[PDB]
Design a protein around this ligand. Sequence first.
Ligand SMILES: Nc1ncnc2c1ncn2[C@@H]1O[C@H](COP(=O)(O)O)[C@@H](O)[C@H]1O
Lengths: 237, 172
Amino acid sequence: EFIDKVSSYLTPDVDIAPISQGAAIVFTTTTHPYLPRAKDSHQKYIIKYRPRTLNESRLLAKLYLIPGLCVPQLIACDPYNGFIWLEFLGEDLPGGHGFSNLKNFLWMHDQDPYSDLVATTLRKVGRQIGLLHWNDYCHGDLTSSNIVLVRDGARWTPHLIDFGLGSVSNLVEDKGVDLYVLERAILSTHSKHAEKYNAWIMEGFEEVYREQGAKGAKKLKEVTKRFEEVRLRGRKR
Amino acid sequence: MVVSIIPQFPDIKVSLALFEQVKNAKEIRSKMSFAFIDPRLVCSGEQMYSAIYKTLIEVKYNKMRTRNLNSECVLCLSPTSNISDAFLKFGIKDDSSQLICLKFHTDDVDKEQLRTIMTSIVKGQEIEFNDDNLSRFYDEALIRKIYKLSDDFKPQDVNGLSRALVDAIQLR
Ligand SMILES: Nc1ncnc2c1ncn2[C@@H]1O[C@H](COP(=O)(O)O)[C@@H](O)[C@H]1O
């Protein structure tokens, strides 16, 4: 019934392919929502439908304006019917290893992760989270599926997606919980290398804060302390 | 000139034309169906089309605020909701030397007739409505003031600037 309603809303002139359904439904389309045919610049786009859309759209727009932060373009918003159209980020990994989110990238490299490529990519993931928190934003659902790698030649450029549960916030408690959710998501694969991955991510996070002089150093101490407290309160005592 | 459709609104056509060396902007204003838009505030087709999209979403699914679709689209170019402010800032001015001529068509549009009508109104030279030509006439400093962009925002190119304007349009 969702398919009926969406295709009726869009009309038959907009192709759609469902790719994900959670507790929002996500499609891809080759049709740009407003540029004349062939005057757009990308092969495909994302349509995110909520049968909240406003919150996510507002956060995507605010984050784009922050130097260094990598988020998908907000192309169109219909808050009356619950549609957001976004830039499609990422691609299929070679060898059938899946969509280029962080989870799949780590699985692909899990037998041999000690490379410049893996360490550097994970440090860049941490930099994104560091920029987000430095600027007093919170992701709210920071798993390895919500970090998407975009190919840049032989490198990967981490982007953040899914700001449905995001917020503006200068609370260190919010920051620690974001970090803890990612740490646990990464640990949950049971990989022998999961601790090292989290270590590389934290290196990138810390680098961002230390680039902000004495003020950054003080703020970082605050965050890391709270993060340690969250870890303690995270398991049975 | 270009005639376009928004995919989910198949029966509405929009015509867009760009003019330079305009000599009679004051006259046009005094005789103000078309919208006459100041290209100093328009850096790309992406930005213009995003406002056309917003116009149709607002009118179909929320509330039209102004007289017609042409005027509603001028409002939808603005980051804020004061109608008079939008008309003043995004509409042509007495000193305008270029303009965008926009019209919503709610059959197939008679193009020869349309060109004749536009030429009877505008004293100036039509050029192609495209990004190469829009890139000649936008004023980044003015855009930054009107869309309230921070100096810390430093796009490397027009696409980067356009993306911020589209954001403002979609979230108005
Ligand atoms: N901008 C995007 N680019 C590529 N894939 C996306 C994008 N947004 C969402 N997805 C896919 O849709 C799934 C669900 O998205 P979400 O509802 O934002 O959690 C994600 O895990 C991605 O696989």
